[PDB]
Write an enzyme that holds these catalytic residues in place. Structure first.
Site, short mmCIF file in Angstrom:
data_model
loop_
_atom_site.label_atom_id
_atom_site.label_comp_id
_atom_site.label_asym_id
_atom_site.label_seq_id
_atom_site.Cartn_x
_atom_site.Cartn_y
_atom_site.Cartn_z
N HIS A 119 0.79 -1.23 0.00
CA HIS A 119 0.00 0.00 0.00
C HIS A 119 0.83 1.29 0.00
O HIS A 119 0.25 2.37 -0.24
CB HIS A 119 -1.05 0.02 1.13
CG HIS A 119 -0.49 0.27 2.50
ND1 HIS A 119 -0.18 -0.75 3.38
CD2 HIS A 119 -0.24 1.42 3.16
CE1 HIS A 119 0.28 -0.24 4.50
NE2 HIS A 119 0.26 1.08 4.40
N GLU A 142 -0.16 -7.79 0.70
CA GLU A 142 0.54 -6.60 1.20
C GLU A 142 2.06 -6.72 1.19
O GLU A 142 2.74 -5.79 1.65
CB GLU A 142 0.01 -6.08 2.54
CG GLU A 142 -1.29 -5.31 2.39
CD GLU A 142 -1.12 -4.04 1.55
OE1 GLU A 142 -1.86 -3.90 0.54
OE2 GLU A 142 -0.24 -3.21 1.92
N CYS A 156 5.21 2.34 7.45
CA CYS A 156 5.02 1.08 6.75
C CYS A 156 6.13 0.82 5.76
O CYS A 156 6.66 1.75 5.14
CB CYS A 156 3.66 1.01 6.07
SG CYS A 156 2.40 0.66 7.27
#
Length: 163
Positions: A32, A56, A132
Site C-alpha cells: 500500500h 501486502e 510502513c
C-alpha cells in the site's frame, strides 16, 4: 543484537513509507505504500524489474545492481513464533527507532477491510503512519535475516510476509 550501520542503510524512503534492500538487486516493501501509475522505480524502467506482490508484500528484482555495496541477506516467510525481532524504523527526521517485537502467529488477517498475509507481534518495552515498509529483522548466527515489512498496528504490530 544491535543493527549495524550497513543494515540501517538498506532502509530506504519509498512512496508513502519505506522499503528494504535485501541484496544489490532485491527490494521489498509493503504494497500500500508503493507509488501507482509510475513507469519507473529508482530510475529504472518497469520493464527491467521483476515485480511480485501478494497479501501486502511487494518484492522487486532489478536487472541492474542498484546497491552493489551490499551483501545478499536471507529473506524468510516470517519467523518462528516467539522470535524477538527488531523493526528498523526510520523517521523522516532521520531518527533511528529500532523497536523490539516478540513475534506471534503467521496468519491471514483482515485489517481495515484488506487481506494481509502477515505475522503479528507484541512490542516490548510505537509505530505511526509513515512507518510502513520498515523491515522486521533478527540475527541468526552470523547473518541478519529479514522476515517481513511493517504493515499495521492496533501494543500489537503486524508485518506483511512473503507467501
Amino acid at each position: 543484537h544491535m543493527a549495524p550501520p550497513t543494515l540501517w542503510s538498506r532502509v530506504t524512503k519509498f512512496g508513502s513509507g519505506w522499503g528494504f534492500w535485501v541484496s544489490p538487486t532485491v527490494f521489498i516493501t509493503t504494497t500500500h505504500v508503493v507509488p501507482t501509475g509510475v513507469k519507473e522505480f529508482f530510475g529504472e524502467p518497469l520493464s527491467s524489474i521483476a515485480i511480485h506482490q501478494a497479501g501486502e508484500f511487494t518484492q522487486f528484482r532489478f536487472s541492474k545492481k542498484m546497491r552493489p555495496d551490499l551483501t545478499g541477506m536471507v529473506l524468510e516467510e516470517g519467523c518462528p513464533e516467539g522470535t524477538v525481532c527488531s523493526v528498523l524504523i526510520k523517521r523522516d527526521s532521520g531518527e533511528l527507532l529500532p523497536l523490539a517485537v516478540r513475534m506471534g502467529a503467521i496468519a491471514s488477517m483482515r485489517i481495515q477491510g484488506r487481506l494481509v498475509h502477515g505475522q503479528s507481534g507484541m512490542l516490548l518495552t510505537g509505530t505511526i503512519p509513515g512507518d510502513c515498509g520498515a523491515p522486521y529483522v533478527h540475527k541468526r548466527g552470523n547473518d541478519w535475516v529479514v522476515c517481513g515489512v511493517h504493515a499495521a498496528a492496533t501494543n500489537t504490530v503486524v508485518c506483511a510476509v512473503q507467501a
